[PDB]
Design brief:
The structure is a homodimer. Chain A is globular, with a radius of gyration of 16 Å. Chain A is of the alpha+beta class and 188 residues long. Chain A contains 6 helices and 9 strands. Chain A has one domain. The longest helix of chain A has 19 residues. The structure holds 1H-benzimidazol-2-amine and 4-chlorobenzene-1,2-diol (4CL) (2 copies). One 4-chlorobenzene-1,2-diol (4CL) binds next to helix 3, strand 2 and strand 7 of chain A. The PDB classes it as isomerase. The entry lists the keywords isomerase. The assembly is dimeric.
């Protein structure tokens, strides 16, 4: 990940004007839509939190959790730490990132800071549900000037995405002011 | 460097009791001694600064500044960013690190933050002197409880090194309380 840390602008885009900041969300959304497309119900929820972190969750199968034979760490960690632009870029440029994977009846939890895992992926409990959730806090060391998520930029993009992805429910929630939207298109 | 960041204790030593914190200084000192031996004057100065950083300087030839043909960056950057455990470990676990190299009539400077270079090694001026200097600020995210450098732990190890490296002068300075020593065999 040090290649991304050396020149963040080359991977995420302009880190001053806010376009790079919002590209962080859309990169994670693309991964969530991919996971949502595999599965029948297909819902993603994008939440702008009061602390200016964003979470993106899907109810798909859950990203793989088994140990990668070569890398010697969970497949999830490989996805988060090995170089659209990839979720590993978002991880590298986030001062904190929380990963929650529900898969094979088990809840898996891992925490990252600036792309560095704080511990190995751990089974913390049990669950009837399946899916992946990433919540990330953009790095204030990288993202300057514009450091807050504008609702309208996300809302407009997710509406455009809904029409390309049939049967996928996309919910947008703003916990700062309670503003909500639900984009769901059934075409085909 | 992410392997070091992931398990700092395995490379530097215990990050809570102060062992790891002081090993950061000793790792830089090892490289300073090697450089000091290859020069004429053969002196190292270890300075504990008031803001809880440590600088280690030698008066040797200066570490190489030219572009590494494989890595495609300065040889100095390769030393600071590629895996004694190496100064790259110290760089990875320092919230800031300042590198200054005096070599071939020129002063070179570079700044790192958590092992990430902020710019390429750059020529900032001219000089007749030669040597290398690294000043590092230990990461308070990694190093907990014992965050401040105890003078006597450093003094003890530098004394041992002065006997083993008989030709090399070693000065220790503490800018917090003005305490100082000069170890030379
Ligand atoms: N604050 C901070 N910034 C970092 C960049 C890379 C790795 C660890 C870091 N901790
Ligand atoms: O829902 C998600 C699915 C996959 C990734 Cl990498 C991130 C997500 O947030
Ligand atoms: O004096 C020094 C010489 C070489 C290195 Cl890598 C670090 C120093 O501080």
């Amino acid at each position: 990940l040090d290649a991304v840390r050396k020149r963040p602008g080359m991977y995420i885009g302009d880190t001053d004007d806010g376009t790079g900041l919002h590209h962080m969300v859309f990169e994670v959304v693309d991964n969530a839509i991919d996971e949502a497309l595999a599965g029948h119900c297909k819902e993603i929820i994008v939440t702008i939190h009061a602390d200016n972190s964003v979470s993106v969750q899907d109810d798909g199968r859950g990203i793989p959790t088994g140990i990668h034979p070569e890398e010697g760490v969970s497949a999830a960690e490989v996805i988060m730490t090995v170089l659209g632009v990839g979720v590993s870029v978002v991880n590298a440029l986030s001062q904190k990132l929380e990963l929650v994977i529900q898969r094979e009846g088990k809840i898996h939890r891992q925490i990252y800071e600036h792309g560095v895992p704080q511990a190995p992926l751990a089974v913390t409990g049990e669950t009837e549900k399946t899916g992946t959730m990433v919540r990330f806090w953009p790095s204030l060391e990288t993202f300057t000037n514009v450091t807050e998520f504008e609702y309208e930029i996300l809302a407009k993009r997710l509406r455009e995405l809904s029409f390309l992805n049939s049967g996928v429910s996309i919910r947008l929630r703003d916990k700062r002011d309670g503003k909500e939207d639900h984009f769901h298109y059934e075409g085909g």
